[PDB]
Design a protein around this ligand. Sequence first.
Ligand SMILES: Nc1nc(Cl)nc2c1ncn2Cc1cccc(OCC(F)F)c1
Ligand SMILES: [Mg+2]
Ligand SMILES: [Zn+2]
Length: 338
Amino acid sequence: DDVPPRIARAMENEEYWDFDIFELEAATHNRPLIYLGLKMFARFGICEFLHCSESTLRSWLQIIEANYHSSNPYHNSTHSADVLHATAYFLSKERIKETLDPIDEVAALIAATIHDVDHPGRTNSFLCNAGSELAILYNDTAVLESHHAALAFQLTTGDDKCNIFKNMERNDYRTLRQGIIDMVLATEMTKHFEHVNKFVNSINKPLATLEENGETDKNQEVINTMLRTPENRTLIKRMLIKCADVSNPCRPLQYCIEWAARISEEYFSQTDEEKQQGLPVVMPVFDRNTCSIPKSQISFIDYFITDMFDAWDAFVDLPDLMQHLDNNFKYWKGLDEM
Ligand SMILES: Nc1nc(Cl)nc2c1ncn2Cc1cccc(OCC(F)F)c1
Ligand SMILES: [Mg+2]
Ligand SMILES: [Zn+2]
């Protein structure tokens, strides 16, 4: 409650898509997650649902944020707080509100908070080629995604101070734990097109078919019943976390550029280590000595962002994100000048 003024002023317009996440980063001194988590979890009423104290939530955010590595240019707690902001924005949209249940909202907001915890600033493919402890521990399969969810549950339930789940009932926790794990694991790159195509095929195309019939009261209930199944709610949750995770190209230009520099610097660090250690170079284009950041951002947006956000926008209606996406794409194209 008693927040200092600059951090309070940094968190004023957090329902809005335009949000100065880097000012929140500077004002909190690399602690944006704990302050933005407290406000978001309070506004959604999360501890009322989980029956946790404000003091149990505080310790939980603390130990989760602590295990985010500040030395990572991108994969630090500021990224998680940003993904929490985009997650809350999507939940607040009319289509998600009338489709998802309160337990899903709780699963999404916790999942955004924990989804990259203890990221080492290296890709899964780096850890497998290096034979890292977590690649041997997780058998080269979704190495970091399994670690994030597992460590998050180790930190939460391992201590009575941090366990925000301790006052829940048996069945509710099993359902909520399975929801979090599924959203955290869905962020793995190799499953990108699989999760996008399942969303298009099972949601967008069926929903577009039924919208051709009309705006009938009996028709809306068929649409409501179809979307609200457990299978389709899972597919929406995977899409929502996946979009929030890589929402930075749909941000205001000033933030879009900062996120590009951070993730690029992070991939250049891995490339310097791979050449030094003799490891196979998994991202050859991302070398600080040869990489055109604007052109790599264009390739990134064409490969992962454009179709995914096209489908998500067709479902949720996200005009501001697509307008920013267009403006940012044109900015990158305009910097060539050659
Ligand atoms: N602006 C960005 N540019 C680049 Cl080069 N990578 C980014 C960016 N924002 C997040 N990432 C991380 C990333 C990298 C590759 C794929 C990816 O996919 C999202 C899902 F498929 F895993 C996310
Ligand atoms: Mg991740
Ligand atoms: Zn992430």
